[model samples]
Structure formats: structure tokens, C-alpha cells
Target: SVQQQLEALEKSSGGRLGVALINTADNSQILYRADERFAMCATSKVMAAAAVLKQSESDKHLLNQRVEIKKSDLVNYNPIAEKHVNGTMTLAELGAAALQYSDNTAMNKLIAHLGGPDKVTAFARSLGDETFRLDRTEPTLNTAIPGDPRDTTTPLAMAQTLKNLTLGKALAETQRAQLVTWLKGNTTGSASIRAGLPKSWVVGDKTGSGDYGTTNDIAVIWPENHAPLVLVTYFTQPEQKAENRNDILAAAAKIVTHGF
Candidate 1:
């Protein structure tokens, strides 16, 4: 029934949709286009943040290091990071800017500080999934070229890695907790997956938007008293210029979370 409902939704979605739902309790999952590539957009910030944290686990002072925000670092969709231009923020603070505010410039700065996008890819690859890749920085990565594989990831790959980084061994216990804290503080997904969930449930998520109607949200959800569920929703329209459909994402989330 879930599959059929999802198919119905896909047929009417006006675009291609990818969904991946994983139950951490048993590692069971339901997948629809979970293995196909979709541009990660700003959703890649999660992995970049995870890479920063993973490095901090070894260095201990990584997050505490101060970072100068040069005006040159500014980019489109950098509302939060732009405010800090010509100022300085700790590595952790920049991470918060990227995750919570979805600040494009903040993410690019982090990607550079971490020694480039390849490092984030390496960090993700270490998690046992080769399907995740980050070959460019922000703005560029958000392009979401039609069918282009660069800066893309499969729903299942991202879903598994998100679960690993937040709930598994990718990060130390404290680091994992820290990542969860940052995710829970995110401000961008309220109208996406969060709106689809029941009031009693809790969710932490990252939202991504790009050209070609590409919009995505990946989240860890807790249904009051139940084990966590990891869900990844990605949408893309064949038309080069298409409007985002957050409503479709919300509907998909409701079906998965409610089993309807």
C-alpha cells in the first residue's frame, strides 16, 4: 500500500521524486528511486558538518579554531554568513551557520577549511557507501544539472550515511550528539518534513533547494516513544526551470510516517 500510494503520488508529482525511509531499529527500509542520483544541493552541508566534526574528534581543538570571514567568501543565499563577513567565527559557529541557517557562504568556507569538497566525500565514503560524492563547493554544487552525476547522491546512500553519522560509528558518541543538536536546531525544514509530522513527534533535518525544481529534505524523526526513522526526500523536474513543490514533499512524508 505504501508503495502504491507513493506511485500514485509520483505519477501526479509533476516531476521525478525519490524517497528513502529507514527504520534504525531493524535497519529495514522502503525505497522508491532510492538508488538514483539526485543533486544534493545544500543538503550536502550535513556531510560537510559531519566531516568537520569527525576531524575534531582527532584534533580536539578543531571546532574551537577561529575562522576569518572575508567578504570574498560571500555567496548567494548566505544570509547568516554574510552578516559575519569581515568578522570571525569559530569553526563550530560557522558549522551552525551552515546547518541551521543553510548559509551557502558558510558552507563553502567550511568546505575549504576542511581542505576541499573531496575531504567531505572521503568522510562519507569511510562510512561504507560509495554512492555519495561532493566534487564542488556551494552554489556550484547546487546547480543540479539535469542527469549530471557530479555533486549527487542516491537517497539510500545519503540516508544510510546520515544514520551512521548521527546514530552510528561515523562520529564518536559526543560528536554524534553534537551533530544531532545542530540538526535539531535547523530552521529551514519546518515547512517541509517537519510540517508533515505529528505535533508529538520530534524531527531534525536539513533542506536543500536548487535549479530545475530540485528540492530535498533529509531527516531523522522520532515518533513519540518509537525508534528513530531516517527519511530522505528528493525532487527534480525535467524542465530546466520548474517551481519547487514543498507540498508534495509534505504529502510523501505523511504517507511514510503514517503508513498510509
Candidate 2:
């Protein structure tokens, strides 16, 4: 009956939602699904961040090394006051800012420093899935070329990334812990996953939204003792409406909480 209800809601939302739920301890169980392979937006930042940490570890680069923030590094909505006036920031601080605030400027600066989008994409590939493409630092028409460099990812891939990071396979334990801590401190709103959870429950994850018809959140919901469950919800098209988007996410969270 719950499955039927979920399917009905999925249909009503124009069937543009792709969802994958898994018990982190074991990959055998599947909670649900829709399309999954909807083009990713800023949500890909998770992979990018992982790539940065991985590279830093391999090259023995100090995380605290100062990385200058340039004028071009400033993204459109970035809130960094120094970004507006051209300033420098440390690698650790920038990474924290990127995750905690989803600062586009900070992300772009890091991307540029790390050797552009292709570098991130290559790192994501090393994680095993090749479905992701890092076209632009931020979702913008001018940057996303026609069919050439469009950032995209499957719901399954997104979930896998989160799962790996949770299990400490994506990066070093310290780096992963740093990411989790930063994610825990994330304060951005209007995201799908965290929108439904009770205030007491903490969600460690990332959210991405873009004008090209994409809104997504990949989250790990921590319960009392049972292993944390991964919920990856990616939505596109007609369901992208503000109300409908949040409705499905809240509904999914409720179902997962009840089922878990």
C-alpha cells in the first residue's frame, strides 16, 4: 500500500523524480526508485569536494595553505564579503565555506585552483562511476555548452558517493570526518531531504538547485542505533515547482523514518 501511494505521488509529480534509498551497512536492500539519472546541478559539489581532499592527501598539500580568492573566483550569489572585493582565503576555510554555505564563489575558486572542472570529473570517475560530468563550476547557461560539457549524474551514483563517504572509502577518515562536520553545520534551506526531518534529527548531506530544471538532495538520516540510511532524491521538470518539490521530499523522509 505504501509503495502504491509512493508510485501514485511519483506519477502526479510528472514522474520526474528519481529516488534511491539504501541501508548503508549493506547495499543489498533498496528502498525505492524512479529515474535517478537526471542531470545533476550544484549537488555535484560533494564529489568535487572529495576530489580536492583526495588530491591534497596524495600530494601532501597542507589543507590550511592559503589560496587567493580572485575577482573571477567570485560566483554570482557567493556571500563572501571579500569575494566581492578580491581577497585570499585558506584551502581549509574555502572548503568549509563551500560545504557549509554552498558558496558558489568559494567553490569556483577551489575548482579553478584544483585545475578546472575536468579535474573534478576525473576524480569522480576514479570513484568508479563515469556517469558524472563536471561542465561548469556553477549552473549557468553561458558555461554549460550545447551537449558538449553538461554536468550530469544518476541518482544511484549520487547515492553511492554519499555511501562511500559515510563508510570512509571516498577519502581519508580525517578528511571524511571534516566533511561530515562541515555538512552537519550546513545551514542552507529549501532543500528537499532536511525539509522533512524533525528538528532534533541531524541530516548530513548536500543540496543542489538550478534553472535548467533540477532540484536534489542526497542525505544520510541518522537514527538512534540502526545504521544511518542514505536517501537520494533527484527531481526535474514539472515537479520542480517549489511546493511539489518539498512535498515529495517531506513525504519520502516520513516514509523512511516510519520504515526504518
Candidate 3:
């Protein structure tokens, strides 16, 4: 029934949809096109943040180091960074801006600090997710060309990697907790998976939007009185170019959770 509802939804929207649902309680799972690649979009921010935190474990000063912001680096959809142009914010603030606000400029800044997109990819590989790759920076990364492999990650890879980083031993104790904290503070998932979840459940998520009507949400959800769930929902229409509807993601979540 879940798969049938998702197929109908994708057909109506004229787009492809992918979902990965992991019930950590019993290790039960469900997948729909979960192995297919989709544009990473702002979800890459989560990877970048984790990489930065890992680096911080050794440097100790990486997160607290002051990083200057310039007006020239400002890009579209940068709510947090745009207001502080010509000023300075710590590296930790940039991470927060990218994750909590999905600020493109802050994301780009983090990419630069990490030395490039390749380092982020390396970090993903370090997590043992060979399929996850970050090839470009923001704006460029959101191109989302039909069938292009650059800047893409499968729903399974994204969800499993995030689950490991959040609940497993992917990072040190403090770094892992810090990453979870930042995710919980995200402001972008209200219309996506969060909308379908019960109000009492706790959800930490990041949302992403890109060209070709691409929209995504990756989340770690703690359902009240139940074992936690890790969910990833990705949708995209390349040639047909459908509208990016957050409600589609919401419906998918509701469908999967109906029998859980």
C-alpha cells in the first residue's frame, strides 16, 4: 500500500520520487527507488557540517576560529550570511547558518574552508559511503541536470550515512552530539517530513531545493514511545519540470508511517 500510494503520487506530479525508511527499532526498512541518485542540494550541508566537526576533533580551534564574511561572496537564498556582510562570524556560526537556515553563502564558505568539494566527498567516503559525492559548490551544485551524476547521492546512502553519524560511531561522542544538535535546530523541514509526523515526535531535518523541480528532506525522527526512524525523501522532475511541492513529501511520509 505504501509503495502504491507513492507511485500514484509520483505519477500525478510527473516526477520521480525516492524514499528510504529505516526503523532502527527492529532494523525493518522500506525503499522506493532508494538506490537511484538525486541531487544533493542543501542536504550536502549536513555532510559538510559533519566533516567540519570531524576536523574540529583534532584542530580543536576549527569551529571557534573566526572566519570573515565578504559582500562579494553573497549568493541567493542566504538569509543568515546576507545580514552580516563585511562582518565576521565564527566557523561554528557558518556551520549553523548553513544547516539551520540553508544559507547558500555560508555553505560555500564552509566548502572553501574545507579546501574544496573533494574534501567533502572524502569525508563521505570516510563514512564508508562510496556513492555519496559532492562535486560542486552551492548554486552550481543545485543545477540538477537530468541524469547527471555530479553532486548526487542515493537516498539509501544519504539515510544510512546520516543514521550512522547521528546514532552510531561515525563521529566522536561530542562531535556526534553537536551534529545532532544542529540538525534539531533546522528551520527548513516544516512543510516536508515534519508536517506528516505527529506533533509530539521529535524531528531533526534539513531540506533541499534545486533545479528541475528537485526537492528533498533527510531526517532523524524520534517517534513518541517508539524506536527512532531515519527517513530520506527525494523527488525530481528533469524534463517535465513539475512544481516543487512540499506536500508530496508530506504525503509520502504519512503513507509509510500509516502502518508503522
Candidate 4:
């Protein structure tokens, strides 16, 4: 009955709907129409964050160290640029800016500090999934021609990444702690995966909007009386409505939590 409801929700997308939810408590799983790749958008920032944190594990002094924010470095789809006009911030805070706010400029800054988009890709490879690919930086993200590879991943791959990061040691202990802190601090996706969850549940998530009619949110959800689970959902439509997208995520959350 729950799978039937999930399928009905998937049908509402009108375009590809990719989903992967794992009950880490027992390694149980659920997957919907997904076996291919699609653009990941800001969701790729999670990998970039891992790339920088992993590289800095031996040199975490960089996290507390401050850096300049040049006007030329600024880009669209950023929420922090206006509020944080001081032109200077710690690398650690900048990482927060990217993950917590989906700041494109800060995301590019992190990638640049990691040397290039390649490190992000390398980090994804470290996750043992080739489905997540990075071909451009945040500045040039939306500039890519639609349907061409900019940055992309599959729902199963993303769900696996979340599952591993939560339980299989994706990040070191220190960085892992900080990663959870940062993910919990994230304020995006109020209308996505976190919506409709019980008030007592804890949700750490990352949200993304793609150039090709897509919206995604991947999260590790924790319930009060049950083991935590990772739920990753990606939706696209030829012409999807934002309101409907929020409703879809809300419905999915209701179904999953109800089932659990």
C-alpha cells in the first residue's frame, strides 16, 4: 500500500522521478524509477564539502583561517553574498555558507581551494559511486546547456552516499561530526524532504534545483523510537510547479514516516 502511494506520487512528476530510501536499521531498501543519471545541481556541493574536509583533515588549520571574497568570485543562486558582504570569512564558515545556505560563490571558493572541480569528482569516486560526476564549478553551473553533463548523480548512488556517510565512515570522525553539525544547520528545503516529518524527528538535508526541470533533497532522517534512515528523492517535470513539488515531497514524507 505504501509503495503504491509512492508510485502515485512518482507519476505526478511527469518527468523522471528517482528515489532511494534505505532503512539502515536492517539494510532494507526501496527504490523507484531510477537506473540512470541526472543533473545534481547544488547537491554536488555535499561532495565538494567532503573533498575539502577530507583534504584538510591533516591540515584543518585552513578551516579556521580566513579568506577574501572578491566581487569577481561572486555568482548567482547564492543567498549569502548579500548578507555577508564583509569580503572576508574563515574557510570553515565558507563551507557552512555553501552547505547551510547553498551559496554558489562559497561553493566555488571551496572547489577552487581544493584545486579544481577534479577534487570534487575524486571525492565522489572515493564514495565508490561513479554516478556522481562534476564537470563544472558553481559559477558555471546553470550556464551549461540543458541535457549536457554539468554535474549529475542517480538516486540510488546518492542514497548510498548518504547511507555510507551516516554509518559506513564516509568522513573521518572529526569531519564527520562537523558534517552532521553543518547538515543539521542547513536551512534550505523547508518544502522538501524535511516537510511533513514529525516535529520530534531530526532531519539533516541538502536541496538542489537543476537547470533541466529538477528538484532534489537527500537527507538522513532520525525518528525518536526507531533507527535513523536516509531518504533521497529527485523529481523533474517538463514544467513542474514549485507548489506541486513541495506537495509531492510532503506527501512522500508523510508516507515514509507513517510506514516506519
Candidate 5:
């Protein structure tokens, strides 16, 4: 039944979705990779964050290190500061805000503090991803550039990153633990990857959205009966309604949860 659902979804998706699933316990897998190597969008931040944490740990930088968030640090918009006068936060606070709220300003601040996109890219490569890239920073919505190389990854690459994170092989054990904690706190909603879980199950994940119809999520799912699994889904094409996007994700989650 799940296989049939996959076929129906693949047909209706018009071939715009790429999905990969890996059962962590046995390392077995399934993939429906339509354009799996296509450049991904902001979901690349997961790698960026990991790179920063890895470097920090190596250099003995404290996870709770405090840094200021200023007006210059703002990337998208500052509802709090623009509406009020007080809007300063620390690195820890910003990291939580960035991951939990998908705060672009906070993310840009973290990226800049970590020495720009190039350094972040290098960090990603250090983590065994040779193909990931941090292209440039896009601060606006309407005027966003296309393919100017802000940040990009492939579905397969993303899946690998998730696998590393799950296996505690991406960074030192303590650093990996902290990264997992942050990822588990990620609340920025992407309907596709989280669609089919049991009501109380926990997941560690990151999501990305960008112009030109890009939507992506990479998550580690700990199913009740099955071992942990890494699930990655990336969608692109003409923009669709949020409901349509959710439908695609729901279909994907259903299939993965059923182990088909």
C-alpha cells in the first residue's frame, strides 16, 4: 500500500521531489531520488551550524559564549527592535532563536561571527562533505538572487550529513550532543518530514525555504518499532500552496514510517 502511495505521489509530484531514507541500525536504505544532486537552498544552514560548533569545540570555545546581536546583525527584519527599542541577545539566545524560530537575522549573525560563508563552507568540508558550498548571503525576500551561491547541498549530501549526526561521528561526542540538542529544539515548521510520526515521538531536524519554489527538510526519525532513520526530502519547482506542500510531506512521512 505504501509503495502504491509512493507511486501515486511520485506521479502527482510531477517528478519534483527527491527523497532518501536510511535505517540507522542496519544501514539499509531506500531512495526516490529525482534530481537528488540538485543544489539545495537554505537547509544548508544545518551544515553551517555543525561546522561552527565543530570549530568551536576544537578551539575550546564555550557553547555558552555570549555575543551581542546588534542592528547590523539583523538580516531579514527586526520586529522586536523596530517596534521597540530593546533588542539585544547573546550567541546562545540567537542560536536558539535562529533554529527554533528560523530567525534569519540571528542566523546571519552566527554565520558572520563564524567568519563568513567561506569559513562555513570549509567547516562543512571538514565534516566529510566535499561538495557542500556556502555561496552568499541573501537578506531580502523579493530581491533575492537566483543561484548566486549563498548556500547549497544535494539531497544525497544532506542525507549523509544527517547520518553522521545520528551516528555521533560528525563532531566530538560532547559537541555532537549539543548539536543534537539544538536540532531537537528546531521548531521552524516544514510539513513534509514530520508528517507521519506518532504523536509523542521526538525528532532532530532542520528545514529550509527559499525563492523559486524551494522547500526542504532533513530529519532523524526514531520510530517506535524500527531503529532510528535519516529522512531527507527536497522539493522545487513552481510555488504551490502550503497545503500542497504539506500533502507532499505527509505522503513522504507515511511511506517512510511504514518502511516501504
Candidate 6:
């Protein structure tokens, strides 16, 4: 049945679809078209968050300090920021807003303040994820001053980043917990992985959306009494005005979980 579910999901995709699932309990896994590259969209914010966490380790007060948001800091897709005109929030609070709400401007602020895309990409490589590219800010929700894709990551690469984060290799123990806390509060992934979950399960994930018809959601779901499962789905050019791509993703998620 799970295999059939996978087939149905694949057949439904109008374009590219990538999936990666790993069982944290025993480490078994499956990857369906996962090695290929895909746009990272808001999902890239995970590394941006990592950069801030890394900075916090060296400067303990960084998380406590507030960064002022001027009109210059304002941009579109900033749900959390629009409510606060020229206001200020701590690194910790901003991180929460970015992870939980997928606030693009909050994400841009986090990335830019932590030494920009170079630092974020380096952080991804630090997590043993080398197949990723971070090229710009969320200034316009998506970009290409170069007209090149702004950010990209393979499903496996993004999954590896999450694994490393879970293993506490990418962040300090405390900050890792904080990261989980922020992700657990994620309110932006309703049409993605969370859409297929059982009542007893819980997932903390990062969601991304932007130009080029991208829709992506990746998460680590803790199924009760079972080992945690990592689920990632990246799909583009989803059939418009049809069965929502989110449902396709949800079906894929259910398929991955059904076996493990």
C-alpha cells in the first residue's frame, strides 16, 4: 500500500518532486529523487539560524541584544515585522519569528546580521551538507540580481543538515534545544508534512516558498514510541488549481511513515 501510495504521488506531480526519509530509531531510510538539486526557498533559513546560533556561542549576549529595525529593514513577506514599525527584537525572538512564522524579512535580518550568505553556506558545509548554495537575501521573496537562483539544496543535503543539528554537531546543546523549540512552533507548514501526520505525532520543520513555483517542507517527526523520522519534500510546477501540491506532499509523508 505504501509503495502504491508513492507511485500515485509521483504520477500526480506535474514537475520535479524530491523526497528523503530517514529513521532516527534504527537509521534505515529511503530517498526518492532526493540526490537531485532543488530550490531551497525559505528552507535555507535553517542555516541562517545556525549562523546566529554560532555567533551566540562566541558572544553570549548576542541572543539577548536587540537589533533595531528601521524602514530600510522592512521588506515584503515580513508578517512579523509589518506589525512592528521600526521596532526592535532580540536575536532569540527574531529567530523564533523566522522559524515559526517563515517571516522572510526576519530571515533576511538574521542572515545579513550574521555575516551574510557566505557564513550561512559555510555553516551548511559545516553540517556535512556540501550540495547547497545560498546566494541572496529575501529582499523580494525570491531573486536574481544575477537572475540566478537565490538558494538551493538537494533533499539529502537538507536532510543531512537536520540530522547534524539533531546530533548536536551544528549547534551547542542549549541552542539546539532552542532551535527545536522555534521549529516546533512553526506555523507555516500546514499544507506540507504536518498535513499528513497522526494525532500522536509531532514535527518541527522549516518551510520555504518563493519564485519558480517552489513549495518545500522538511521536518523531523517523532512518532510515539518509534524512532524519529525525517521527511523532506521539494516539488515545483505543481498542477495549479488542482489537488493541492500540499496534499501530494502529505501523501508522500504518510507513505514514508507507514513503512517505518
CA RMSD per model (angstroms):
1.1, 3.1, 1.1, 2.2, 3.4, 2.7
Highest lDDT model number:
3
Candidate 3 residue pairs in clash (backbone atoms < 3 Å): none
Error of 5 at 21 (Å): 0.8
Which pairs clash inside model 2?
36-155
**Candidate 4 global lDDT:** 0.77
Candidate 4 residue lDDT tens string, 1-260: 87788888777656667777888789887777556566777778888887777777888587887778777777776688656665787888888989899999889888888888877788888879777888788756643233566677788898898777655678788888777788888898788888868878888888877544677788888898899888887766654333226557666767766776
CA shift at 189, candidate 3, in angstroms?
A: 1.1
Say what the RMSD of model 6 is: 2.7
- Which scores better on TM-score, 5 or 6? 6
Model 1 lDDT per residue over 38-117, tens place: 99998999999988988898898899899888888887888887777788889999899999999988898799998999
Q: Per-residue lDDT tens digits of candidate 3, residues 28-140?
A: 88899999999989988999989999999898888999888888888877899888888988889999999999999999989999989999999999999989999998889
Error of 1 at 163 (Å): 0.7
TM-score of each: 0.97, 0.86, 0.97, 0.91, 0.83, 0.91
Residue pairs with clashing backbones, model 1: none
lDDT of 1 at 182: 94
| lDDT (CA) per prediction | 0.89, 0.68, 0.90, 0.77, 0.65, 0.76
Q: Report the lDDT of model 1 for residue 150.
A: 89
